[PDB]
């Protein structure tokens, strides 16, 4: 059905780009958390080693 298809020729450059952007934002949140966790683990191994 075509009215939706020309709504698809007018707009979803914007909507596809937006979706890509929300995804990349999520993935950057994830990798930042995945660099914060090795920090904590690392301070932990510090505290073990010094106790040795």
């Amino acid at each position: 059905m075509d009215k939706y298809l020309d709504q698809f020729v007018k707009a979803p450059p914007a909507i596809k780009f937006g979706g890509l952007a929300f995804v990349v934002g999520a993935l950057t949140a994830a990798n930042f958390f995945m660099v914060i966790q090795p920090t904590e683990e690392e301070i932990g191994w510090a505290v073990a080693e010094r106790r040795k």
Binding site: V47, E49, R50, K52
Partner: protein, 54 residues
């Protein structure tokens, strides 16, 4: 608190464990003696005196 042990590390034990261990040695050491024993003694013998004087 500290947990089942602490976090990752576990943690903190650089303090507990560092002002501990201890120092062990552990001195697997200073137990009980058999001592040891000397040996006895050198004579053949004779007579002299005391043959004439008895």
């Amino acid at each position: 608190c500290e947990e089942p042990p602490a976090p990752a590390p576990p943690p903190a034990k650089p303090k507990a464990a560092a002002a501990v261990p201890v120092k062990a040695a552990p001195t697997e050491t200073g137990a009980q003696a058999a001592p040891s024993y000397s040996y006895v003694y050198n004579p053949v013998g004779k007579r002299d005196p005391f043959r004439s004087p008895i």
